[PDB]
């Protein structure tokens, strides 16, 4: 069994992206007999697609769990659906602001995550990790990768399971925000990392 | 040197109050040559006052740091001011809902915290702990104890420093909220506990 | 040209639903040569579907604009997508709480609104009406009707345009909330009504 | 009987301040036999104090109701207390950012508003206007003027009643915010204006 976990590089002026650290921390670890691969994706349309496709083709993971930062969210959120659309509120790390455009022309308007989202949420709660199901992953890079991953699965037969998980800011990211007159919610890095590991474990169990 | 740290018992239907655990965890520990005393207060007007006064008279702390739970707040908050008023939105653990009434008739309308709040906030940020200064501790039990403590200091000469710190919900407290259709912010118990220890350390340093 | 505008009856303990008044106020009015039909739907799965289908078949509107109340939202929100799923956080007015179930088995996972959402948002802003595009209409009754309407259009060829618009609470609905210790955002009934009229006008212009 | 109502000029990059319009709209009107004076204050420490003092000395109002804009607040808020401190999160319209400094050295740490706040809130609710009591007017210009007004009353015997009322953004102010990726709450100008008139009426009735 092979598991692919992806994270994103910093974006929107943020100095760090905790999902980048998650991917690096999980890369190379084994959970039982399952091998985990951690890869960092660029927050750039086009390039992110190239890297994602190459990685999927290279590793051919049975399970793909894409992780991203959701500024302002107070708990772990498991995405229920990926939408075939791009409508960026801000430009990507290359200064491109795509608006009202499909991700894959002619493909389904949406794809449901194939991760066992309800079982994952339940296990997270048992571990004392606040989490809920999100019905919109946005229409920026997180949704972009989520959709392409699910499209790959529907078109190529793998990965068997694919989904997206958004995490809150970690505490250290809030420090300089306080001066800007506002304090968004945060969650410890340790908890965010464990949440992803739990998702992997539940997926492995639910897979076959 | 003696430090008094107080917490509160559960209230408002909540199953736990993380500040109760903070007080118990800090009780009896020593920070350098300073002795720390941890005491749990009831969330009941009158009784809370009795316990507080007895404890202050008994221990005669040089520093008093009162801690409480602030449901919904996203980071550690250090209270700048205590107000001479009681206007409860909900009744206390005895079913009493006091409205528009002074805490100490004839006493000052307000007292500024005497803890070195700015230095505490600065040290917390250096430790990677989100925190900000709050200008209202509410007009329920937290403010009640904060005011009585500062009044005691102004009238009896001790404690030399007195203040209040509110902490967010800890993660495990959010679990059953999710079902009630809403996800408030949270902070790890470990971080909330460390934040209080840091406040004690800064107060000890700033004291003399 | 015929325009169908729907609203919902009160639900979730609320005494009123401003969208019910919107539907009644717009029923029978004419905008140019276009005839507007206003109908109130029950907040009940199954029954809502029956009424919706009968109304669509009866009137055969060229444009269908479904309106609903979105407690907590601060501005007019135009829904971008309807999802083929039902996952109610609360039961409907008949005490039924449907969970993880498709609206139309075998039908597309999602449908994009066919109303000219960007042009509507732009006109609303020009009129001084705060509004934004929402990417999730929830998975309760609003999404239920939005999806069924768009499914009808894709399967029957009419209405040519279909979409959903969520409105905030109107001021009078906030009064008794204040006592429950919390103050959600609101928008005047006059503005909410005008927003819907504007949407109808833009749709008529964009249609042919 | 004479009533003084003040508002503020635009600040913080905002193009307008609805309270400036409130003051201008109420200036010169009569409510019964009571004469109302409306004056606009600068959002500048020092200068605001000069204008306020001159106005109070000039008019010698029986009632003083100071109004200000509270970005983000969802309903009318009546301030319960003014604090003897200045700790600005942003500089004033002159580029001055005062931090940790008293408004009037040696004066009381705080003053309670002398407006009949509970009766005002009650009448507002009866009129269908969402409103609540705020326990912190901030430590910027609004609090600055509120404190100086109450200090004037305690030191000079007039005005007999003094207080502060914060109002939400009005709808037109939200338009350009939507693009900045965020939609704060708003309230119609008509309602905000009526709320202030109601406060004046209740104060006049409660006065003698």
Swiss-Prot record, chains A, B, C, D:
Assigned keywords, A-Z: Cytoplasm, Disulfide bond, Hydrolase, Protease, Thiol protease
Catalytic activity, EC: 3.4.19.3
GO molecular function, one term: pyroglutamyl-peptidase activity
Catalytic activity of the protein: Release of an N-terminal pyroglutamyl group from a polypeptide, the second amino acid generally not being Pro
UniProt-listed SUPFAM superfamilies: Pyrrolidone carboxyl peptidase (pyroglutamate aminopeptidase)
Pfam families according to UniProt: Peptidase_C15
Functional summary from the UniProt entry: Removes 5-oxoproline from various penultimate amino acid residues except L-proline.
Subunit structure: Homotetramer made of two disulfide-linked dimers.
Protein name in UniProt: Pyrrolidone-carboxylate peptidase
Organism this protein belongs to: Pyrococcus furiosus (strain ATCC 43587 / DSM 3638 / JCM 8422 / Vc1)
């Amino acid at each position: 069994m092979k598991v692919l976990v992806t994270g994103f590089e910093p974006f929107g002026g943020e100095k760090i992206n905790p999902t980048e650290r998650i991917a690096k921390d999980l890369d190379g670890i084994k959970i039982g007999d399952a091998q985990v691969f951690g890869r960092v994706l660029p927050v750039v349309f086009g390039k992110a697609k190239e890297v994602l496709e190459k990685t999927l083709e290279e590793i051919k993971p049975d399970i793909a769990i894409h992780v991203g930062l959701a500024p302002g969210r107070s708990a772990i959120s498991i995405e229920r659906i990926a939408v075939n659309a791009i409508d960026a509120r801000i430009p990507d790390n290359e200064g491109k602001k795509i608006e009202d455009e499909p991700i894959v022309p002619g493909a389904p308007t949406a794809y449901f995550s194939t991760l066992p989202i309800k079982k994952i949420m339940k296990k997270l709660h048992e571990r004392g990790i606040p989490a809920y199901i999100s019905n919109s992953a946005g229409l920026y890079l997180s949704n972009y990768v989520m959709y392409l991953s699910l499209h790959h699965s529907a078109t190529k037969g793998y990965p068997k399971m694919s989904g997206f998980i958004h995490v809150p800011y970690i505490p250290e990211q809030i420090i300089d925000k306080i001066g800007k007159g506002q304090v968004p919610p945060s969650m410890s890095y340790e908890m965010v990392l464990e949440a992803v590991k739990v998702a992997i474990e539940v997926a492995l169990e639910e897979l076959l």
